[PDB]
Structure 1
């Protein structure tokens, strides 16, 4: 009767608002992904302008039922903070996923350590990056946790350093051990000779002397250099009388 004759006009204005929403959203999506910025930020601005002009046609619509503008924008601001505080941690991930592609602390296919978990990065999606670990698991890390912590890129510099700690007995000859561990890493072929090769006495432990051996090698064959120097240490120390010691004790008897 007296009410519905404006409700039909409100439905017409809201359906042409939906039409112009799809039109302007797809227009700015077609323009921005080709002109300047990105395929990800432009979709965010497309959704922003889409749900912005939806809000504009809602404010224009709800005046036709008598509801004033200062009340419509109050209810829309309440609903806007409702959906905005729903999407706080859902949009911090998007804003971080922009920075992870714009600045690239890691590329796809690069062994990283994103705060405890270490693996090859498969892809950086919109909200969360997928990495595959060393043992075949798939770890999906949200972008708000990557950008708010350290990113230990294991595979961006070509040379990396091993660190063997060889515990020998206290009665061994330090010159003989420092000569044997030198003659191992002087004949190893993948250990870089133009960098810092150290075989020096690291510490005097509880039951063993700890020598430290730190050698540099290319990041592809780091683990093979570790496994081939350690096995050769185990071979050349038994053939030379050096004894890896057990956890020694010094028991004093009191046969009461």
Structure 2
């Protein structure tokens, strides 16, 4: 062979070229493939890193982070190409794979919580437990909805204050809808002197509630002496009425009661402390 007398000495006279052509050429094929892969990945990364910016800038963005992210991802893709080259030549990169995988796991964990809100949003969207037009509470947070979307929900307070809350939080909690039900019960409590007649007061109260229309006479209308306290005996009342008027009626009756009790001669006592007196 011309291999090892022109470009090399006659090393053992053991001409390797024709004997091991495939072997010696395997390295070369590996090498060429590698470098080609490299350059193509490079140009691709450049193009794409600018292209994503091209597409995103139309949408709402910030420039600094846009640039930072595009450049960083570009660099990472590059790294990918590199490891592939190393693998082709026959180097052990499993360690590199391991470390980068650990990094991916760590970042996934870091963002997990945020991601959960995404999940929550999707879920509630398909389920539609409540809608923006509706008025509800999400647990300690009452007020009307304004909008609901990607990661957070937007609702207004009775005072008007706007509040925002993440989706992941709310789904975990319990939920209450008032809009979905038209009618609701109402409750009242009263306290009076022990002497006073329970029957008189009872029928009085009755006459009042009779007087009202908005009440649901169909539905029950309970009036009892609930329980006994230390200062006053305490009555309870129950009614049903449409959600819309619930508050108003709630106020109205109370005024009525006050007027009617004084007319009746009844009284609501003050805290009563009894004493025994001795001089010393």
Q: Does TM, normalized by the shorter one, top 0.5? A: yes
Corresponding residue number in structure 2 for 1:119: 143
Q: Is the counterpart of residue 73 in structure 1 residue 97 in structure 2?
A: yes
Q: Deviations over 1:32-70 (max 9, x none)?
A: 999999999999999999999999878757757987563
Greater CA deviation, 138-147 or 88-97? Answer: 138-147
CA–CA distance in 2 between the matches of 1:110 and 1:43? 41
Secondary structure of 1:147's aligned partner: helix
CA distance in 2, matches of 1:31, 1:175: 79
Q: Distance in 1 between matches of 2:188 and 2:263?
A: 19
Q: More displaced, 100-109 or 183-192?
A: 100-109
Superposed CA deviations along residues 175-218 of structure 1, whole A, max 9, x for unmatched, are 01111111111111111111121111101111111111110000
Indicate how the Cα distance of structure 1 residues 3 and 244 shifts in structure 2: closer, same or farther if over 3 A, else same.
farther
- Structure 1 residues 184 and 30, CA, compared in 2 at 3 Å: closer, same or farther? farther
Paired with 1:100 and 1:26, the residues of 2 have a C-alpha distance of 36
Q: What TM-score does the superposition give when structure 2 sets the normalisation length?
A: 0.70
- Secondary structure of residue in 1 paired with 2:87: coil
User: 156-165 vs 50-59, which deviates more?
Assistant: 50-59
Aligned-partner Cα distance in 2 for 1:101–1:63: 46
Measured in 2, the distance between the counterparts of 1:77 and 1:153 equals 45
Separation (CA, whole Å) in 2 of partners of 1:143 and 1:80: 25
Is the contact between residue 62 and residue 72 of structure 1 (CA under 8 Å) also seen in structure 2? Answer: no
Bigger drift between 115-124 and 61-70 goes to 61-70
Residue 24 (structure 1) shift: 12
Deviation, 1:101, is 1.4
1:40, 1:98 within 8 Å by CA — same for their partners in 2?
A: no
Per the alignment, residue 184 of structure 1 pairs with: 208
Q: Measured at CA, do residues 211 and 18 of structure 1 come closer, stay the same or move farther in structure 2, by a change above 3 Å?
A: farther
Change (3 A) 1:201 1:54: farther
Distance 1:244-1:85 versus aligned 2 partners, 3 A rule: same
C-alpha change, 1:32 and 1:64, in structure 2 (3 Å) is same
Gap regions ≥5 residues in structure 1: none
Structure 1 Cα separation of the partners of residues 89 and 223 of structure 2: 86
Residue 235 (structure 1) shift? 1.4
Higher alpha-carbon deviation: 77-86 or 170-179: 77-86
Deviates more, 1:40-49 or 1:19-28: 40-49
Structure 1 length as normaliser, TM-score?
A: 0.75
Q: Indicate the SS of the match to 1:220.
A: helix
Q: Which moved more, 1:87-96 or 1:149-158?
A: 149-158
More moved, 36-45 vs 233-242: 36-45
Q: Identify which range, 54-63 or 152-161, moves more after superposition.
A: 54-63
Partner of 2:170: 146
Pairwise CA distance, 1:5: 15
Greater displacement, 126-135 / 213-222: 126-135
Q: Contact 1:192–1:216 at 8 Å: present in 2 too?
A: yes
- Conservation of the 8 A alpha-carbon contact between 1:32 and 1:38: no
The farther-off stretch of 198-207 and 35-44 is: 35-44
Deviation, 1:79, is 2.2
Unmatched 5+ residue regions in structure 2?
Answer: 1-24
Whose helix proportion is higher, 1 or 2?
A: 2
> Measured at CA, do residues 240 and 128 of structure 1 come closer, stay the same or move farther in structure 2, by a change above 3 Å?
same
Q: Is the 8 A contact 1:41 1:98 kept in 2?
A: no
Q: Secondary structure in 1 aligned to 2:113? A: coil
